[PDB]
Amino acid sequence: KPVSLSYRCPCRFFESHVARANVKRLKILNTPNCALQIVARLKNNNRQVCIDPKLKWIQEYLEKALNK
Helix, strand or coil: CCCCCCCCCCCCCCECCCCHHHEEEEEEEECCCCCEEEEEEECCCCCEEEECCCCHHHHHHHHHHHHC
């Protein structure tokens, strides 16, 4: 089993299935200690899942529009 119980990152899991249209709020936490951890709270599901940072829409939106 891949057991990585060593904390240098909050989001160990990432969902790439996140659609910006269904994202109520997201935030990319750029940890120098880890990498990009992003969170998506669904408008409909109301639940939050860590978003995969390599999603093209994520970086083009949160990183290019919000962050710039």
